[PDB]
A paper describes a structure:
The MRSA COL MnaA crystal structure was solved at 1.9Å resolution. The protein crystallizes with a dimer in the asymmetric unit. The structure is closely related to that of other bacterial 2-epimerases (root-mean-square (RMS) deviation differences with E. coli MnaA in Cα positions for all atoms in a monomer between 1.40 and 2.90Å depending on the chains being compared), and a similar dimerization interface and quaternary structure is observed. While there are significant structural differences between the E. coli and S. aureus models, they are located on the protein surface, away from either the substrate binding site or the oligomerization interface. Surprisingly, there are differences between the two monomers in the S. aureus MnaA structure: the RMS. deviation in positions for all Cα is about 1.0Å. We refer in the following the structure of the ternary complex between MnaA, UDP and UDP-GlcNAc as the “closed” form, and other states of the protein, either in apo form or a binary complex with UDP, as the “opened” form, consistent with past structural characterization of the enzymes. In addition to differences in the quaternary structure, other significant local structural rearrangements distinguish the two monomers. Notably, His 205 to Gly 211 (E. coli His 213 to Gly 219, B. anthracis His 209 to Gly 215) differ significantly, but in the monomer nearer to the closed form adopts a conformer similar to the one observed in the closed form. Collectively, crystallographic results described here allow for a more refined understanding of the enzyme regulation at a structural level: a dynamic equilibrium between the opened form and an “intermediate closed” conformer of the enzyme is present in solution in apo form or in presence of UDP only. Mapping of MnaA LOF mutations isolated in MRSA COL Δcap5P into the S. aureus MnaA structure shows that all the sequence changes are in close proximity to the substrate binding site or the UDP-GlcNAc binding site, therefore rendering the enzyme inactive.
Herein we demonstrate that MnaA functions as the previously uncharacterized 2-epimerase that interconverts UDP-GlcNAc and UDP-ManNAc, thus providing the corresponding substrates of TarO and TarA in both S. aureus and S. epidermidis. Wall teichoic acid (WTA) is an anionic glycophosphate cell wall polymer in Gram-positive bacteria that is present in roughly equal amounts to PG. WTA is synthesized using the lipid carrier bactoprenyl phosphate and a sequential series of cytosolic-exposed plasma membrane associated Tar (teichoic acid ribitol) enzymes, starting with TarO and TarA. Genetic evidence is provided demonstrating that MnaA is essential for WTA production and β-lactam resistance in MRSA and MRSE.
Numbering used by the authors:
A (entry chain A): 1 to 38, 44 to 60, 67 to 376
B (entry chain B): 1 to 62, 66 to 376
Write the structure that this text describes.
Amino acid sequence: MKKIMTIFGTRPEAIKMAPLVKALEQEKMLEPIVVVTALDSVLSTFEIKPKYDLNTLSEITSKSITQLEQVIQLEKPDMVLVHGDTMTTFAGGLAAFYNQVPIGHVEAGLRSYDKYSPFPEEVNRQLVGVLADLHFAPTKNAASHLLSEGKYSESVVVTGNTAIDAMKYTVDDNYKSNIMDKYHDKKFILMTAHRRENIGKPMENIFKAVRRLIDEYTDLALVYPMHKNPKVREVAQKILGSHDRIELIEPLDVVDFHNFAKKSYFILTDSGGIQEEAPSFNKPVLVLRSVTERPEGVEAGTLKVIGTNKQNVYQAAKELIDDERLYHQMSEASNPYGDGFASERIVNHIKYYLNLITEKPSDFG
Amino acid sequence: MKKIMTIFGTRPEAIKMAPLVKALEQEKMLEPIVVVTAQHREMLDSVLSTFEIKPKYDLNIMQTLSEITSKSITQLEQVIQLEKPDMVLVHGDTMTTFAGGLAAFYNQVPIGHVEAGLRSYDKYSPFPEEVNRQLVGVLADLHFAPTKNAASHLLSEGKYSESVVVTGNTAIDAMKYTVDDNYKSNIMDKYHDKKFILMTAHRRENIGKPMENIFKAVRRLIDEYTDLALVYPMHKNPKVREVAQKILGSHDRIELIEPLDVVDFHNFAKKSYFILTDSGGIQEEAPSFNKPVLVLRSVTERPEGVEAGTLKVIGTNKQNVYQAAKELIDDERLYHQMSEASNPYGDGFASERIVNHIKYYLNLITEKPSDFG
Ligand SMILES: O=c1ccn([C@@H]2O[C@H](COP(=O)(O)OP(=O)(O)O)[C@@H](O)[C@H]2O)c(=O)[nH]1
Ligand SMILES: O=c1ccn([C@@H]2O[C@H](COP(=O)(O)OP(=O)(O)O)[C@@H](O)[C@H]2O)c(=O)[nH]1
């Protein structure tokens, strides 16, 4: 009945938007129109078929704006939903605004308050914050950023992060894997590293710290689904290669990654999405960054921001291994990012906003 | 020297940026690189000749709002990468302002926002200007706020304290260049025995009935008051002109004319009885001419002139426009209250303050200018 356009252009966004597309599909009064800019394995896992598959930073924005406008004018959606902070999020929000279509921002209000870090993500989410009619903040902290900036009180709602909802479709407590069977008698670290700010010396530092832990603790193993970057793979192979307790593998599909994460000892990562998922797996996370836009997990105790200095990475992981009570406290901390029903809240906020229902959902929480 | 790129694309924007380009020219340590995008093409040239400015780049851009933005960002990036400016200056809230600010940001060039912080706090009014100035507020490194009220909007939104500076509006600086001692006009001479209303209206007012309402209210005042006249420099839009002709045409004491060059418009505004307009720029200039303004907008981002007393916001309802104008005509005390009010928008030296803030920011000078106000 009411057309809800969902625009997304990356695999991490597809994971976060997929459960919302399923909730919009299940809702009788709303019809989702899926637009991919833009991944295929995520779309098949959640059984989503895009209606549109489109397809310098200036050229990306320029092309995205005009093509998304063509799709918006053809479909005439009642609302456009954009996610987070990528080039597509801003281009989709701006094309919607120019066509006077209401905008819902999924995962609204994250802030580093530094224009050049993350670049261009910090500016993208701040620019979308200007356009959006509804801000689906994942946490009360993100909602406070928007309320303090002067966004209208009633337009800011706390729903939780849809990353936790996606886990309901992927986790299988009877999951099977030959790599997991190989390390049945080991405690494995699950590591991922993709941030441009960690290319070069940060990566060498991280790998030497992890290699030292692998040498010192014989019952430890490492599973590292590596980004395809040839330089980082060369560096990974020199420090971490030819070791039977280290698995240097390709990126995992989301079913395999979530099930690996659920069996890991702890996670080492610079990922934003893994920080929101990890507390629901009861897995401590050591965040390989110097600044965070997810302080909620730090306050809850689920994560610890350790930077990329070789000594700090090594010492922080060693403390997690040696102090079982600290490990258990980080594992048991509740997820401040959601309870798995963010999509249902978002759907009911959309219905309320479009005058299809009288009840407005309460803030998650 | 440092390269200061000044990007602007419309005649109103050229009027406000021209005195700043002249101050950047006069400044020994800075070089202005003038980039014009020409959404307004013909009228933009007479502004450039009045102030003696020759653009280094003249891009042909100018179509949906998406297409304008899409074309402007890539072409302005090409100019930014070729020139490698030390700072990009954008003005106000047009499509060029945002596209130039975004291309500068993607190339990590510092951004100075001339006329920063105006807010209606309504996403669809002015559309797309309110959103454009809010989007540029996210990108800018220096916010040259025209008034303390505009600076308060930026400070309340969380912009860094030292990045927000009050300079006054460059619209008042431009009026120093539009004085013509040998000024004459045959239209003014024809109405030497009349009190004329000077009216201007944007093309967007003709989407729905606002323009028709305004014109019927004004025609009624011309019919009722024989000593009144109307001077209306019309946008070229054929649809605007059909509606003007159909309501205000074939009428004694009404001049339906072409857009005026800025020297004539400023000199017509000084001899008018009062101004009837939806213009943003005229609201900032009018107090310096001691002229009352009836603002044809439902929401304003210029409350300073309302507080000072030169401006009254009256909307576009036919009865309200007619009653508000009739009250100005009948109540000489109220006309006097709106006339003698001081200008809260500037003193004519905003450009010098902007230039010294730029020098300070790029570490060329130690003194930071004080806040105008
Ligand atoms: O090999 C991998 C690594 C990550 N993930 C998932 O991808 C998201 C995180 O993506 P990434 O770290 O690349 O991006 P970020 O979240 O930092 O933007 C989370 O949902 C992870 O569970 C995945 O499916 N396979
Ligand atoms: O025929 C005209 C009408 C206006 N102006 C000037 O143009 C600016 C206002 O332009 P406009 O109202 O079209 O745009 P706005 O300010 O509303 O964006 C002010 O400097 C006016 O003095 C002009 O030179 N000639």
